[PDB]
């Protein structure tokens, strides 16, 4: 990993010295740098050994001498394919932008502000202080991606009181991170694993992490930032948001909640149970109220992510496997649906949803692919999302199956409204006022669709290569939770 | 795929030896998977019993299948 780690930063910076009004070169070379960092992510996958509690390719550089809070970079188990999904998806955003001129949307600026692999950092960052810096850090890139080239639906903004609470929750986690950091000098995640805290304080520290996380996670009391953040997000800002920025909260719980505070997690199991359950119920019923397509997909994403939560709780190896594989399948499916709804916007240039009609005439291949992914967002058994969600379900393994009975409503209403909305979008010869402008999909368009469908099917028919490469790590996490 | 059953030196109180405490985790989970795969091998052997009989295909192994199941306890 030593050299092949910093591909996106090197690429971005050495392209910053190429303003190059003639876009062809910046597009080509940024895309090549992204694709080669993805290639090195994938060869790093191939490099994996599914047999160690240690982290696969550890590296560091002194960051502050005393207590050495340094860039500790591990990729065991989950992070392995989290960074893989990150890379998998970043060329997708670079490729959804072969727009010809791309002038006001200055192409090199979006290249340089999507080609920041701080997501790679955080998923490999294995000392929760610097790990803290990155999800909060990616907000500066996310904010510029969300509105600079993002569609303007309102005076671009986020609920100000909610945003203040969201960042306050993030900084509340920071106080908890410091309390553990000075609690026993424990710099990094290996030693924060080894150490043992006061049960009276483990619960406080757990909920303090949980503040920021359950903001990043879309739980019922605070999740509103996803719809408002997406309906304004650009086509490639949503692909990243759904893809990774939601995985942030669940991976945070996975690494720095379950094997960190085993007693606090034991104590708060019913809390997250009910939270995620009622969140899934709400976000299943809501798309009744929401007619906005981006809000629809964002709420389906909330549902899936709170399923990821209702599964990560468990010492069930199947439980957390279903959690992380619902994460992978979600970063595939919701991002593929955001790709879909972005194509559906642009090809129609309209931001009402009642206006997407006669799709089987305009773009019938888009109808086929939109089904190929909406069956997934409802988790058709056979798809990747099915393996994910059902290992989430069997996560009631040592349990007594009372939260699966709330996932009942959460997923039945989800699949129901998934089908309702796929109909509502493709229904009828509802002639729109587009002046016979059909907008058939592009070869590059079906290309950027290719990898999501491929990952989806390759998981849904063969989840081994992902459950393997993971079981050793998750099982170590579980025994530390034992 | 070459590990050792001894976990070095870990007493019951595990705060003392973080090296040995991590090693007990990493190889007692190896033992966890030992007996999990033992249950899985005995399950493939339950399928093997069924394959063999084909006419009883419940009996002549069912109490031995209960022995198989005794790899798991506390069913309540």
């Amino acid at each position: 990993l030593s050299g092949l780690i910093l591909c996106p930063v090197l690429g971005s910076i050495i392209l910053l010295f190429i303003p190059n009004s003639r876009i062809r070169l910046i597009r080509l070379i940024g895309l090549c740098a992204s694709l080669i960092t993805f290639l090195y992510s994938l060869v790093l996958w191939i490099q994996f050994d599914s047999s160690t509690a240690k982290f696969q390719f550890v590296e560091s550089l002194r960051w502050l001498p005393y207590e050495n809070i340094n860039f500790y970079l591990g990729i065991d188990g989950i992070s392995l394919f989290f960074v893989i999904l990150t890379t998998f998806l970043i060329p997708i955003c670079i490729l959804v932008g072969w727009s010809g001129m791309r002038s006001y949307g200055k192409e090199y600026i979006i290249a340089f502000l999507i080609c920041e692999f701080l997501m790679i950092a955080v998923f490999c960052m294995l000392d929760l202080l610097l790990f803290y810096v990155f999800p909060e850090s990616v907000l500066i890139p996310m904010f510029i991606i969300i509105g600079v080239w993002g569609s303007r639906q309102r005076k671009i903004k986020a609920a100000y009181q909610f945003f203040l609470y969201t960042l306050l929750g993030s900084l509340f986690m920071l106080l908890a991170i410091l309390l553990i950091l000075f609690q026993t000098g424990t710099t990094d995640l290996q030693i924060l694993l080894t150490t043992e805290f006061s049960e009276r304080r483990q619960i406080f520290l757990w909920i303090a992490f949980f503040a920021s996380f359950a903001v990043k996670v879309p739980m019922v009391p605070v999740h509103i930032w996803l719809p408002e953040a997406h309906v304004e997000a650009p086509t490639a800002g949503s692909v990243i948001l759904a893809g990774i920025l939601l995985k942030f909260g669940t991976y945070g719980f996975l690494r720095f909640s379950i094997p960190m505070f085993p007693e606090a997690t034991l104590c708060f199991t019913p809390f997250i149970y009910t939270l995620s359950a009622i969140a899934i119920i709400y976000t299943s019923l809501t798309t009744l109220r929401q007619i906005d397509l981006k809000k629809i997909i964002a709420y389906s994403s909330v549902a899936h992510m709170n399923l990821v939560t209702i599964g990560m709780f468990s010492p069930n190896i199947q439980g957390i496997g279903g959690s992380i594989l619902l994460m992978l399948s979600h970063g595939l499916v919701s991002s593929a649906l955001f790709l879909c709804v972005g194509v559906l916007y642009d090809r129609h240039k309209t931001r009402l949803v009642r206006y997407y009609g006669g799709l089987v005439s305009t773009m019938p291949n888009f109808s086929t692919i939109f089904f190929s992914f909406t069956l997934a967002n409802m988790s058709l058994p056979g798809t990747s999302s099915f393996i994910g969600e059902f290992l989430i379900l069997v996560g009631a393994f040592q349990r007594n199956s009372l939260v699966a009975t709330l996932a009942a409503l959460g997923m039945i209403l989800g699949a129901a409204y998934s089908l309702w909305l796929y109909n509502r979008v493709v229904s009828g010869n509802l002639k729109p006022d587009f002046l016979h402008k059909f907008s058939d999909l592009n070869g590059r368009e079906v290309f950027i669709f290719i990898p999501f469908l491929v990952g989806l099917v390759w998981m849904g028919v063969y989840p081994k290569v992902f459950l393997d490469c993971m079981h050793t790590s998750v099982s170590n996490l579980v025994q530390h939770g034992k | 795929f070459e590990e050792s059953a001894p976990d070095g030196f870990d007493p019951e109180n595990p705060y003392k030896d973080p090296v040995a405490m991590v090693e007990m985790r990493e190889h007692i989970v190896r033992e966890k998977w030992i007996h999990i795969e033992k249950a899985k091998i005995l399950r493939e052997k339950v399928k093997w019993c069924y394959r063999v009989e084909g006419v009883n295909h419940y009996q002549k192994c069912r109490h031995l299948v209960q022995q198989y199941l005794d790899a798991t306890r506390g069913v309540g």
Partner: peptide
């Protein structure tokens, strides 16, 4: 009704607790 689900959710939590008391 919303507060009803909020309290019945922790009631299902308590049902898990009663199952824990079953053994």
């Amino acid at each position: 009704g919303i507060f009803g689900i909020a309290l019945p959710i922790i009631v299902y939590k308590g049902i898990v607790k009663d199952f824990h008391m079953q053994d």
